[PDB]
Amino acid sequence: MTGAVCPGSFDPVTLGHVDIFERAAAQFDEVVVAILVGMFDLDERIAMVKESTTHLPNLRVQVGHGLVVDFVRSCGMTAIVKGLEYELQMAQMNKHIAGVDTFFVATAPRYSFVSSSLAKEVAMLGGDVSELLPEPVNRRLRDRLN
Amino acid sequence: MTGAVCPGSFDPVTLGHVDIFERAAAQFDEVVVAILVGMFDLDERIAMVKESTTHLPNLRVQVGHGLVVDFVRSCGMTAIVKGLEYELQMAQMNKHIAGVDTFFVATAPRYSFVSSSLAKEVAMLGGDVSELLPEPVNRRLRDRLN
Amino acid sequence: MTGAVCPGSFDPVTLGHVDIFERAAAQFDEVVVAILVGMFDLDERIAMVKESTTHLPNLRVQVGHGLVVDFVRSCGMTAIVKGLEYELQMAQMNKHIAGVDTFFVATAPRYSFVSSSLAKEVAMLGGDVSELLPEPVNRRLRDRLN
Amino acid sequence: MTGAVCPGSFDPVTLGHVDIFERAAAQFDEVVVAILVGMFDLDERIAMVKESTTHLPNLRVQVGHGLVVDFVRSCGMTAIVKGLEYELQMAQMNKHIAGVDTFFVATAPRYSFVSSSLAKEVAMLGGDVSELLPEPVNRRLRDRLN
Amino acid sequence: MTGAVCPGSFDPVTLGHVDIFERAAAQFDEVVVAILVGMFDLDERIAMVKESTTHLPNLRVQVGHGLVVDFVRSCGMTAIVKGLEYELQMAQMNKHIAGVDTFFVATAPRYSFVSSSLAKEVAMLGGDVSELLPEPVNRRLRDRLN
Amino acid sequence: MTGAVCPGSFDPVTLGHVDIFERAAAQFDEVVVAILVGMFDLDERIAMVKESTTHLPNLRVQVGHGLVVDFVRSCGMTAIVKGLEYELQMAQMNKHIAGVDTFFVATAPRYSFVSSSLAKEVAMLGGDVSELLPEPVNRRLRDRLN
Numbered sequence: 001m002t003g004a005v006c007p008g009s010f011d012p013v014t015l016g017h018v019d020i021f022e023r024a025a026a027q028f029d030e031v032v033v034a035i036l037v038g039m040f041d042l043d044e045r046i047a048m049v050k051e052s053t054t055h056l057p058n059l060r061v062q063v064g065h066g067l068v069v070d071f072v073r074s075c076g077m078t079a080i081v082k083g084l085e086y087e088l089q090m091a092q093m094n095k096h097i098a099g100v101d102t103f104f105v106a107t108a109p110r111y112s113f114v115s116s117s118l119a120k121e122v123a124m125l126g127g128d129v130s131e132l133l134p135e136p137v138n139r140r141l142r143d144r145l146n
Numbered sequence: 147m148t149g150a151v152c153p154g155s156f157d158p159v160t161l162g163h164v165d166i167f168e169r170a171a172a173q174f175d176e177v178v179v180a181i182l183v184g185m186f187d188l189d190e191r192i193a194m195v196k197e198s199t200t201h202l203p204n205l206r207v208q209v210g211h212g213l214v215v216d217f218v219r220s221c222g223m224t225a226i227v228k229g230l231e232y233e234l235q236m237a238q239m240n241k242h243i244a245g246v247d248t249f250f251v252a253t254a255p256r257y258s259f260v261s262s263s264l265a266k267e268v269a270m271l272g273g274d275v276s277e278l279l280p281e282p283v284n285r286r287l288r289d290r291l292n
Numbered sequence: 293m294t295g296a297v298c299p300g301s302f303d304p305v306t307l308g309h310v311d312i313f314e315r316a317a318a319q320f321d322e323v324v325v326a327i328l329v330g331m332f333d334l335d336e337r338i339a340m341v342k343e344s345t346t347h348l349p350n351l352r353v354q355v356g357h358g359l360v361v362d363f364v365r366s367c368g369m370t371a372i373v374k375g376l377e378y379e380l381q382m383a384q385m386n387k388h389i390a391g392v393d394t395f396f397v398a399t400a401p402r403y404s405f406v407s408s409s410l411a412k413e414v415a416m417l418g419g420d421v422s423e424l425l426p427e428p429v430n431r432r433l434r435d436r437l438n
Numbered sequence: 439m440t441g442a443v444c445p446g447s448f449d450p451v452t453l454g455h456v457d458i459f460e461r462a463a464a465q466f467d468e469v470v471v472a473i474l475v476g477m478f479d480l481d482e483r484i485a486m487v488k489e490s491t492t493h494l495p496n497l498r499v500q501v502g503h504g505l506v507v508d509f510v511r512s513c514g515m516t517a518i519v520k521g522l523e524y525e526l527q528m529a530q531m532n533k534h535i536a537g538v539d540t541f542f543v544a545t546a547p548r549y550s551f552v553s554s555s556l557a558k559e560v561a562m563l564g565g566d567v568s569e570l571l572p573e574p575v576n577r578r579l580r581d582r583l584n
Numbered sequence: 585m586t587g588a589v590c591p592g593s594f595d596p597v598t599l600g601h602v603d604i605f606e607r608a609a610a611q612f613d614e615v616v617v618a619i620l621v622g623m624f625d626l627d628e629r630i631a632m633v634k635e636s637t638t639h640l641p642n643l644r645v646q647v648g649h650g651l652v653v654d655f656v657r658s659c660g661m662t663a664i665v666k667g668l669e670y671e672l673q674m675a676q677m678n679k680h681i682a683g684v685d686t687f688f689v690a691t692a693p694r695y696s697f698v699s700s701s702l703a704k705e706v707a708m709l710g711g712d713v714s715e716l717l718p719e720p721v722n723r724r725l726r727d728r729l730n
Numbered sequence: 731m732t733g734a735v736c737p738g739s740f741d742p743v744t745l746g747h748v749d750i751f752e753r754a755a756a757q758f759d760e761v762v763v764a765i766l767v768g769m770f771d772l773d774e775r776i777a778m779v780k781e782s783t784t785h786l787p788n789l790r791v792q793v794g795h796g797l798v799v800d801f802v803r804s805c806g807m808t809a810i811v812k813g814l815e816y817e818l819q820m821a822q823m824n825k826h827i828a829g830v831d832t833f834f835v836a837t838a839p840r841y842s843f844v845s846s847s848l849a850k851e852v853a854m855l856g857g858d859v860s861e862l863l864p865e866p867v868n869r870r871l872r873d874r875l876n
């Protein structure tokens with residue numbers, strides 16, 4: 001039984017993130033999105049990820065606390081997956097202390113420039129980033145600025 | 147049925163490569179090492195990979211020709227795996243033309259500086275790189291310089 | 293009528309910045325330096341830029357607020373110019389939301405290591421950075437530490 | 439009268455290149471594409487660029503020989519423009535010897551992974567890169583492999 | 585009389601740091617570790633460095649204040665040494681204002697991923713980083729979390 | 731007795747190289763420039779380095795053959811010094827096989843863009859790079875193109 005954890009703060013989840021979720025889900029038996037404890041509270045973040053991933057039956061969303069590698073090993077998962085040198089440092093640290101591996105996958109070109117932080121700053125100053133975020137995020141983003 | 151292809155020229159295979167093979171084998175149901183058509187001939191390269199991977203029951207070694215993505219899709223595998231911006235270019239090109247994904251994994255620190263080319267040049271000028279290569283490679287390396 | 297905006301916090305403006313201003317001014321009909329809202333207050337920053345750019349007749353200095361791309365398009369300018377991957381992210385975000393282009397130009401070698409932040413920290417601890425800053429900045433820098 | 443030269447071997451011209459041509463043409467009075475003296479011969483390269491740039495009235499295509507900065511200054515142009523550290527080295531060398539400036543612009547995300555060399559290798563091995571190249575190039579590419 | 589200063593906050597000193605100290609000590613007549621004014625207080629930091637460097641007779645530990653280049657020149661030392669673009673900026677700034685040179689040395693592979701900050705965060709959340717830190721640091725680390 | 735080897739092909743030696751030689755000479759008791767076996771023949775290369783380094787009494791020029799680390803250890807020197815990730819690979823390989831350390835030093839800003847290859851190509855096509863090369867090189871460069 002193969003499994004990958006996709007960790008992050010997801011504040012908010014982006015289409016870049018969902019693309020990674022989709023590709024992990026295609027390769028591993030199970031995917032767990034670990035929301036690691038900002039603009040949106042934990043509950044909102046979870047909802048937004050769930051609402052954006054209904055098309056991924058083998059994906060589960062879960063709040064995480066502490067070391068990501070503890071999360072991975074506790075839930076019997078087998079790997080961390082994340083989208084793309086700082087990560088390099090963490091991946092090797094994570095292999096050192098817990099034997100957990102990290103698989104990196106390149107961003108789809110069209111999402112190469114979107115980040116949660118940049119989306120937030122642009123949204124707050126009146127820019128349209130709705131093409132870079134899931135509709136569940138867009139919906140909540142509109143409501144929080146209105 | 148999940149599966150990863152580990153492509154390369156493997157001239158010769160290094161311990162860095164074997165580490166990647168090992169980690170792919172731990173996460174995917176099947177691994178195919180694709181030796182893509184130099185110092186060693188094709189037969190030698192195959193042998194060296196096979197001799198170095200006997201401890202990986204779900205790994206298979208195979209010569210490859212043409213686009214790696216054709217190789218992946220023909221053998222029903224689901225992903226390319228390789229050890230680590232040029233790769234970025236290829237991974238996105240490979241996703242564009244064939245929908246094949248590429249998962250990157252960081253080198254173990256102790257193998258961070260070993261490459262087939264550098265090992266060859268150092269070996270040929272009398273340096274000891276045997277700690278960076280599988281014994282089946284070391285054996286053949288000694289014999290080819292003697 | 294061609295035009296470039298050179299945005300930044302300019303706290304303070306450096307000779308690296310002025311070099312970029314000079315090269316933009318040489319290529320575009322009009323240049324607007326946008327001081328985006330620290331050590332010096334807004335008024336000081338403006339003055340320092342103006343005092344350092346009197347030799348550039350087609351350059352104008354202006355305080356900016358909000359998205360830089362709003363500033364560009366509102367003033368009918370046609371491009372952002374700045375001196376040199378984070379910028380890459382912003383440039384593509386800025387092209388996405390407003391269609392505004394960003395042209396990057398390499399620092400003159402002699403100013404490759406000067407930044408506003410580094411100049412400030414070195415100046416405050418007693419180091420001589422006057423060769424890296426315009427005399428109007430040097431003048432005000434001396435007075436603020438004395 | 440402002441002007442930019444877009445230099446390259448353009449063997450063949452890509453949609454990434456055309457995007458750069460388009461953005462240069464939008465900012466400078468005149469653009470000269472300098473084809474610097476491979477798969478396609480000079481004549482083919484010119485044709486392909488011309489056929490792909492008919493929608494750019496202020497763009498001119500011209501074969502170049504020798505230093506790009508000689509080309510720039512001889513034709514009274516004022517700047518080099520190209521799409522994006524090696525370039526950094528050349529830009530500073532070009533500023534040193536001829537006072538010519540280089541403005542860099544980020545690739546559109548969708549063309550971030552396309553290069554002439556990679557397109558050629560993928561095309562020759564049977565991959566479909568027609569979405570990354572102008573139809574005039576696609577046409578000639580089909581005919582040269584058929 | 586040759587001499588190198590190894591500057592840093594050393595909060596705490598790591599085995600990566602000690603490796604650099606060792607290599608500097610092997611090449612220069614004298615080494616001064618400059619602890620530049622966090623988890624451990626100044627006294628603890630000093631102790632930890634001293635306890636970890638008893639095997640280096642020509643190494644001295646000293647608190648530093650102000651510009652590192654003032655420290656270098658005041659103590660008649662001749663160079664800064666540190667383990668490895670931000671450093672590039674500082675090294676050139678330091679050469680500009682004080683004529684002090686900086687020699688960089690590559691991390692040993694096995695310590696490539698260890699940093700004071702990352703070690704602290706991992707230690708605090710229950711991870712075992714004792715293989716990456718000197719025993720004098722490990723001892724104090726255990727006691728501060730217990 | 732401390733000592734550094736500065737290895738390279740020096741075809742030709744540049745002012746960037748001489749700057750590194752100067753800084754090594756200032757920190758180590760002895761410096762050996764190792765010319766590792768192109769435009770200029772071995773004899774010319776030696777001459778050019780010698781003619782450009784007469785002001786460095788503790789510097790010696792010598793042809794090298796084989797592994798640089800063999801050269802270092804044979805001549806009882808203690809370190810490799812060179813001006814600045816490929817180097818990273820080699821430095822760690824060189825530490826692995828021979829225990830030889832490599833100290834990197836940043837280029838002076840004004841020589842950041844000069845390389846032997848780029849100087850040659852620019853010189854051959856009629857560009858003036860004499861400000862980037864020692865007069866002994868300039869002299870020979872003029873004569874070889876005339």
Ligand SMILES: Cc1c(C(=O)O)cnn1-c1ccccc1
Binds near residue numbers: 016108
């Ligand atoms: C890293 C990231 C963030 C973030 O860290 O805030 C938000 N989106 N993405 C992203 C992920 C994969 C591909 C593209 C973008």
Ligand SMILES: Cc1c(C(=O)O)cnn1-c1ccccc1
Binds near residue numbers: 166254258259
């Ligand atoms: C890339 C590479 C080569 C090569 O490309 O020649 C030889 N070993 N490795 C390697 C692979 C994974 C980790 C470390 C090293």
Ligand SMILES: Cc1c(C(=O)O)cnn1-c1ccccc1
Binds near residue numbers: 311376399400403407
């Ligand atoms: C980026 C920058 C800053 C800054 O961001 O603080 C201050 N100077 N420069 C600079 C600009 C162009 C060339 C060299 C230096």
Ligand SMILES: Cc1c(C(=O)O)cnn1-c1ccccc1
Binds near residue numbers: 452522553
């Ligand atoms: C550099 C380049 C090549 C090449 O160098 O072969 C072919 N296309 N592009 C390109 C240019 C701008 C944007 C994207 C791609």
Ligand SMILES: Cc1c(C(=O)O)cnn1-c1ccccc1
Binds near residue numbers: 599600601604691
């Ligand atoms: C930079 C660094 C830190 C830090 O900056 O916190 C802690 N260790 N190291 C280190 C130094 C040399 C080699 C490896 C690691």
Ligand SMILES: Cc1c(C(=O)O)cnn1-c1ccccc1
Binds near residue numbers: 750
């Ligand atoms: C690397 C190099 C070359 C070369 O490799 O050809 C020629 N000069 N330099 C150089 C060395 C130190 C500083 C600046 C430049």
